[PDB]
Amino acid sequence: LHALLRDIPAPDAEAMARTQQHIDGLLKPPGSLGRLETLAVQLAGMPGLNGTPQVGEKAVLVMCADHGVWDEGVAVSPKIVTAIQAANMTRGTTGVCVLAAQAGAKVHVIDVGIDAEPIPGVVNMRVARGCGNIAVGPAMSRLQAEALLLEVSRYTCDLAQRGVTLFGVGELGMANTTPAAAMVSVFTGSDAKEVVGIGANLPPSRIDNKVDVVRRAIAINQPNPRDGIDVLSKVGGFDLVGMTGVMLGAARCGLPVLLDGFLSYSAALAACQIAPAVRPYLIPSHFSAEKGARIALAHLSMEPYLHMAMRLGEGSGAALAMPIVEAACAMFHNMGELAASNIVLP
Amino acid sequence: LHALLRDIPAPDAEAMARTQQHIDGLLKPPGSLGRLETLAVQLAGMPGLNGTPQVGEKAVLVMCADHGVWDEGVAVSPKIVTAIQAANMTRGTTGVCVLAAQAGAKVHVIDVGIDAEPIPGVVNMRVARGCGNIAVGPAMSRLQAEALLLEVSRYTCDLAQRGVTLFGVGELGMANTTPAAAMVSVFTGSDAKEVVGIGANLPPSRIDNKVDVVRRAIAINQPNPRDGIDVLSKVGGFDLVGMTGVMLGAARCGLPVLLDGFLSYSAALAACQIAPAVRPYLIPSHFSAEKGARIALAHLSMEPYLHMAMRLGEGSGAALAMPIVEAACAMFHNMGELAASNIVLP
Ligand SMILES: O=P(O)(O)OC[C@H]1O[C@H](n2cnc3ccccc32)[C@H](O)[C@@H]1O
Ligand SMILES: O=P(O)(O)OC[C@H]1O[C@H](n2cnc3ccccc32)[C@H](O)[C@@H]1O
Ligand SMILES: O=C(O)c1cccnc1
Ligand SMILES: O=C(O)c1cccnc1
């Protein structure tokens, strides 16, 4: 794992410089395409992209797992829904499946800890049948977290060898906005009440209990903010760890990764804490309607492109933003040049 | 024209009700897909869509024209660029062409007043070789504005008969952010300094002159805020009128129209002033980087989906948002249902 984090490539400044120059000469007022231009330059700096903004095959990775903290009454969805919805993923009827199909991306459903019998068609990487209840102890051991990180990392970069150049991250697990909120509180240093949201339609009355649970998790486990792996293993979850692993894997592979919503933000905070070199490869998608979204994004210093008030998860937001990444590439490769039109602009 | 505005259909509440019920039963926590859900319901209410959110052929209409106010030094792009870039539109090398191609939409270039010889391949609807300089008088006569509105309206709804179900509006005309700013000031009641921007890279030093020009245009012409046609003809432009016409045409046709940037906002303010029934058919795309964008959007009571810091125009933002409209339809038609999975959620 040390090898992994060590071998994460830095961005290619040379390719980025040539990219900027090329974009500046396109048939348009310089800088008029704003963030679409900065996005194209960002992509060009990613080694896995061969010095130019391009998109080959696309894949969305959905990490599924159950959480012991569900027993604390922090989620209104039946715990069984995790397993049921995971199966639906293999049938292409879920929200991320439909949006991914629209973007021409393939969805990979990965079981990293569902509390049910194995589901046929789902990638098996389960650590255990659900993680421990973070309210009374750690979710898992440091060893289990590191092992999963390596496993998911390898799998992710392995897909790159199959033609995948753009990744999307997602999750599925009832009650996961609780550990997500806990990690955000720890990494950000914000009070629980400020980052705890309604998740999947949690009644407003039951909000106070969720906040108490998060505080208990932090007080009991005492996660060290300076150690991303410590935080993940103590008040995180298998699914959250998995998402972090996708981020580390793509970064090592020198490829871009599209974040999704609130759950992904917590995983990205952990990933950046573990390896700052991962940051240049992250691409925001939408602005989650979860209460702690603004705080989490501020600390990641990211400004989402899409404001859809979305809060479904599954990687649905990431899939929805893929067309935007492709647009930046289209702009870069298909637009004409000012010089060819004899047009001169300041 | 009175007939036109009179025959604009109201939204189909019955279809919208069935739409909401269907969306609520999809394989996801109720309301979790946020604005994507509200968008699907909006589409369902549009009569031209046959009671369901759907998208057939897509078209982006780019209205091109020159402005006399260019002589006041409010634009740094050579006046000839309007004609040159209009020709490039027919070659598919411009920004809107590339983004439209990515969305699978066809671009229609319409000349409503370019100050140059006719351009082959461009739809000819020119009123005159550029409009009058709004700083010393009106841009055109009320008659010319009404005639163009009718002509563009008919053309727009005529495309609907060819299979087009989703429209995008755009423009091309050096110095058009000046009359656009003037209209925004008048309709909104805001001071010129608050809504005048840099347009296509206007030097910061030259901003004061642009503001003075806008004030002069308003003082000299005395446009009546309560009369959208009066405002358009006095301190507007041929291109701006054309965009308004696309909005009225699609609304009459009961079809959705995607707005673009700042220029489109001014046209939408005029359209809504002329016929409030047009509002339900308008769909925002991105949030323009032009200074007066926030003010204009507030008065239209619209919240763009995309935050790309874009400021190119041409209808590039509208094309970029088309995939989002298609996603709402995909969600509506392709997602599975909770009942079929025996899943129950509050
Ligand atoms: O903390 P919570 O309140 O439980 O909210 C997080 C959960 O809701 C989302 N989620 C995504 N798809 C879903 C289908 C059914 C139910 C929930 C679903 C997340 O993917 C996760 O499963
Ligand atoms: O008021 P202004 O400062 O002139 O800014 C408005 C102009 O810039 C944009 N615009 C769009 N495509 C362009 C290509 C070359 C130059 C400008 C262009 C608008 O479409 C319009 O032509
Ligand atoms: O932002 C998300 O991804 C999210 C928010 C609430 C519930 N589930 C997912
Ligand atoms: O918002 C726009 O469409 C825009 C802003 C500046 C210059 N041209 C177009």
Short mmCIF file of N, CA and C in Angstrom, two decimals, chain A residues 63-138:
data_model
loop_
_atom_site.label_atom_id
_atom_site.label_comp_id
_atom_site.label_asym_id
_atom_site.label_seq_id
_atom_site.Cartn_x
_atom_site.Cartn_y
_atom_site.Cartn_z
N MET A 63 -20.08 0.72 -4.67
CA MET A 63 -19.67 -0.07 -3.51
C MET A 63 -20.85 -0.26 -2.57
N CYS A 64 -21.22 -1.52 -2.33
CA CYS A 64 -22.35 -1.83 -1.47
C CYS A 64 -21.97 -2.53 -0.18
N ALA A 65 -22.61 -2.11 0.91
CA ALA A 65 -22.34 -2.71 2.20
C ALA A 65 -23.35 -2.24 3.24
N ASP A 66 -23.49 -3.03 4.29
CA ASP A 66 -24.39 -2.69 5.36
C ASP A 66 -23.61 -2.17 6.55
N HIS A 67 -24.30 -1.43 7.41
CA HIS A 67 -23.69 -0.80 8.58
C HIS A 67 -24.37 -1.22 9.87
N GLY A 68 -23.57 -1.48 10.90
CA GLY A 68 -24.13 -1.87 12.18
C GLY A 68 -24.88 -0.74 12.86
N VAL A 69 -24.49 0.50 12.56
CA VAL A 69 -25.13 1.66 13.19
C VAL A 69 -26.61 1.78 12.78
N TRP A 70 -27.05 0.95 11.84
CA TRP A 70 -28.44 0.97 11.42
C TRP A 70 -29.32 0.68 12.65
N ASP A 71 -28.83 -0.16 13.54
CA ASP A 71 -29.58 -0.52 14.74
C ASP A 71 -29.84 0.64 15.69
N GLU A 72 -29.17 1.77 15.47
CA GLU A 72 -29.35 2.94 16.32
C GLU A 72 -30.56 3.79 15.89
N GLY A 73 -31.27 3.33 14.86
CA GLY A 73 -32.43 4.06 14.37
C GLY A 73 -32.12 5.33 13.59
N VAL A 74 -30.99 5.35 12.89
CA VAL A 74 -30.59 6.52 12.10
C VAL A 74 -31.03 6.49 10.64
N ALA A 75 -31.68 5.40 10.23
CA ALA A 75 -32.15 5.23 8.85
C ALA A 75 -33.56 4.64 8.83
N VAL A 76 -34.40 5.18 7.95
CA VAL A 76 -35.78 4.73 7.84
C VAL A 76 -35.99 3.66 6.75
N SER A 77 -34.97 3.38 5.95
CA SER A 77 -35.09 2.35 4.92
C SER A 77 -34.77 0.99 5.55
N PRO A 78 -35.58 -0.03 5.27
CA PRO A 78 -35.36 -1.38 5.81
C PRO A 78 -33.95 -1.84 5.44
N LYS A 79 -33.23 -2.43 6.39
CA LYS A 79 -31.87 -2.87 6.12
C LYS A 79 -31.76 -3.79 4.90
N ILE A 80 -32.82 -4.56 4.63
CA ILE A 80 -32.85 -5.48 3.50
C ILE A 80 -32.75 -4.77 2.14
N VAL A 81 -33.17 -3.51 2.10
CA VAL A 81 -33.13 -2.74 0.85
C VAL A 81 -31.74 -2.70 0.23
N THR A 82 -30.69 -2.77 1.04
CA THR A 82 -29.33 -2.76 0.51
C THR A 82 -29.15 -3.95 -0.45
N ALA A 83 -29.49 -5.14 0.02
CA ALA A 83 -29.35 -6.35 -0.78
C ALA A 83 -30.29 -6.37 -1.98
N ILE A 84 -31.53 -5.93 -1.75
CA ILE A 84 -32.52 -5.90 -2.82
C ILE A 84 -32.11 -4.93 -3.93
N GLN A 85 -31.76 -3.71 -3.54
CA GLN A 85 -31.37 -2.71 -4.52
C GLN A 85 -30.07 -3.10 -5.23
N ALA A 86 -29.21 -3.85 -4.53
CA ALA A 86 -27.96 -4.29 -5.14
C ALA A 86 -28.30 -5.25 -6.28
N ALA A 87 -29.29 -6.12 -6.07
CA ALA A 87 -29.70 -7.05 -7.12
C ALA A 87 -30.30 -6.26 -8.28
N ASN A 88 -31.12 -5.27 -7.97
CA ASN A 88 -31.72 -4.45 -9.02
C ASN A 88 -30.65 -3.80 -9.88
N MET A 89 -29.49 -3.54 -9.29
CA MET A 89 -28.38 -2.94 -10.03
C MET A 89 -28.00 -3.84 -11.20
N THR A 90 -28.03 -5.15 -10.97
CA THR A 90 -27.67 -6.09 -12.02
C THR A 90 -28.75 -6.18 -13.10
N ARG A 91 -29.92 -5.60 -12.83
CA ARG A 91 -31.01 -5.64 -13.80
C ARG A 91 -31.17 -4.33 -14.56
N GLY A 92 -30.34 -3.34 -14.23
CA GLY A 92 -30.39 -2.06 -14.91
C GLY A 92 -31.64 -1.22 -14.68
N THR A 93 -32.30 -1.41 -13.55
CA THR A 93 -33.52 -0.66 -13.26
C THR A 93 -33.37 0.46 -12.24
N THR A 94 -32.20 0.56 -11.62
CA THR A 94 -31.97 1.60 -10.61
C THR A 94 -31.62 2.95 -11.25
N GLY A 95 -31.61 3.99 -10.42
CA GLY A 95 -31.30 5.33 -10.90
C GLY A 95 -29.93 5.48 -11.55
N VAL A 96 -28.89 4.91 -10.95
CA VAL A 96 -27.55 5.05 -11.54
C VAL A 96 -27.45 4.25 -12.85
N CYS A 97 -28.15 3.12 -12.92
CA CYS A 97 -28.14 2.30 -14.13
C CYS A 97 -28.71 3.04 -15.34
N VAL A 98 -29.85 3.69 -15.13
CA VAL A 98 -30.52 4.42 -16.20
C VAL A 98 -29.71 5.64 -16.66
N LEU A 99 -29.14 6.36 -15.71
CA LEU A 99 -28.34 7.54 -16.02
C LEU A 99 -27.01 7.13 -16.64
N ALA A 100 -26.45 6.01 -16.19
CA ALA A 100 -25.19 5.53 -16.74
C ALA A 100 -25.41 5.09 -18.19
N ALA A 101 -26.53 4.42 -18.44
CA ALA A 101 -26.85 3.96 -19.78
C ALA A 101 -27.00 5.16 -20.71
N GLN A 102 -27.54 6.24 -20.18
CA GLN A 102 -27.73 7.44 -20.97
C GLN A 102 -26.37 8.04 -21.34
N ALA A 103 -25.39 7.89 -20.45
CA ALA A 103 -24.04 8.41 -20.67
C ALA A 103 -23.15 7.41 -21.41
N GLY A 104 -23.66 6.21 -21.65
CA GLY A 104 -22.88 5.20 -22.33
C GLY A 104 -21.80 4.62 -21.45
N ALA A 105 -22.07 4.55 -20.15
CA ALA A 105 -21.10 4.00 -19.21
C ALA A 105 -21.60 2.68 -18.63
N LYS A 106 -20.67 1.81 -18.24
CA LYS A 106 -21.04 0.52 -17.67
C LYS A 106 -20.98 0.59 -16.15
N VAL A 107 -21.96 -0.01 -15.50
CA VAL A 107 -22.00 -0.01 -14.04
C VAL A 107 -21.44 -1.29 -13.46
N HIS A 108 -20.52 -1.16 -12.51
CA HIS A 108 -19.92 -2.32 -11.86
C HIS A 108 -20.41 -2.34 -10.41
N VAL A 109 -21.19 -3.35 -10.06
CA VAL A 109 -21.71 -3.47 -8.71
C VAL A 109 -20.76 -4.32 -7.88
N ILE A 110 -20.21 -3.74 -6.82
CA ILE A 110 -19.27 -4.44 -5.96
C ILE A 110 -19.77 -4.58 -4.53
N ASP A 111 -19.82 -5.82 -4.05
CA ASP A 111 -20.26 -6.12 -2.70
C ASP A 111 -19.02 -6.14 -1.80
N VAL A 112 -18.91 -5.15 -0.93
CA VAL A 112 -17.77 -5.09 -0.02
C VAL A 112 -18.20 -5.41 1.41
N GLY A 113 -19.49 -5.66 1.62
CA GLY A 113 -19.95 -5.98 2.96
C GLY A 113 -21.44 -5.98 3.21
N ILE A 114 -22.22 -6.52 2.26
CA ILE A 114 -23.67 -6.58 2.42
C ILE A 114 -24.01 -7.68 3.42
N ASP A 115 -24.98 -7.41 4.30
CA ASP A 115 -25.40 -8.36 5.32
C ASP A 115 -26.52 -9.24 4.76
N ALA A 116 -26.15 -10.13 3.85
CA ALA A 116 -27.09 -11.03 3.21
C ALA A 116 -26.29 -12.06 2.43
N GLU A 117 -26.97 -13.05 1.87
CA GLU A 117 -26.29 -14.06 1.08
C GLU A 117 -25.72 -13.40 -0.16
N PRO A 118 -24.65 -13.98 -0.74
CA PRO A 118 -24.02 -13.43 -1.94
C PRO A 118 -25.05 -13.25 -3.05
N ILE A 119 -24.92 -12.17 -3.82
CA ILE A 119 -25.84 -11.91 -4.92
C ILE A 119 -25.17 -12.23 -6.25
N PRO A 120 -25.75 -13.16 -7.02
CA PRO A 120 -25.17 -13.53 -8.32
C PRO A 120 -25.06 -12.33 -9.25
N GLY A 121 -23.95 -12.23 -9.96
CA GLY A 121 -23.76 -11.11 -10.87
C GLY A 121 -23.04 -9.94 -10.25
N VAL A 122 -23.00 -9.90 -8.92
CA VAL A 122 -22.32 -8.82 -8.21
C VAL A 122 -20.87 -9.21 -7.92
N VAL A 123 -19.95 -8.26 -8.08
CA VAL A 123 -18.54 -8.53 -7.82
C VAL A 123 -18.37 -8.77 -6.33
N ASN A 124 -17.82 -9.93 -5.99
CA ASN A 124 -17.64 -10.29 -4.59
C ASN A 124 -16.30 -9.86 -3.98
N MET A 125 -16.36 -8.92 -3.04
CA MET A 125 -15.20 -8.42 -2.31
C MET A 125 -15.62 -8.14 -0.87
N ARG A 126 -16.63 -8.86 -0.39
CA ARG A 126 -17.14 -8.65 0.96
C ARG A 126 -16.16 -8.94 2.09
N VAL A 127 -16.02 -7.96 2.98
CA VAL A 127 -15.13 -8.07 4.12
C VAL A 127 -15.83 -8.84 5.22
N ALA A 128 -17.11 -8.53 5.41
CA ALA A 128 -17.92 -9.18 6.42
C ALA A 128 -19.37 -8.83 6.16
N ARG A 129 -20.28 -9.50 6.85
CA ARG A 129 -21.70 -9.21 6.68
C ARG A 129 -22.04 -7.94 7.45
N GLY A 130 -21.72 -6.79 6.86
CA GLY A 130 -21.98 -5.52 7.51
C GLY A 130 -20.83 -5.17 8.43
N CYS A 131 -20.59 -3.88 8.66
CA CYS A 131 -19.49 -3.47 9.53
C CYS A 131 -20.00 -3.28 10.96
N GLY A 132 -19.09 -3.11 11.91
CA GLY A 132 -19.50 -2.92 13.29
C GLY A 132 -20.25 -1.62 13.50
N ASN A 133 -21.04 -1.57 14.58
CA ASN A 133 -21.82 -0.38 14.93
C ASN A 133 -20.87 0.68 15.47
N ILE A 134 -20.63 1.72 14.69
CA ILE A 134 -19.70 2.78 15.09
C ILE A 134 -20.08 3.51 16.38
N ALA A 135 -21.32 3.37 16.82
CA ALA A 135 -21.75 4.05 18.03
C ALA A 135 -21.14 3.45 19.30
N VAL A 136 -20.74 2.18 19.22
CA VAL A 136 -20.17 1.51 20.38
C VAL A 136 -18.76 0.99 20.16
N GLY A 137 -18.19 1.31 19.01
CA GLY A 137 -16.85 0.85 18.72
C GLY A 137 -16.49 1.14 17.29
N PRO A 138 -15.40 0.54 16.78
CA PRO A 138 -14.98 0.77 15.40
C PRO A 138 -15.78 -0.05 14.40
#
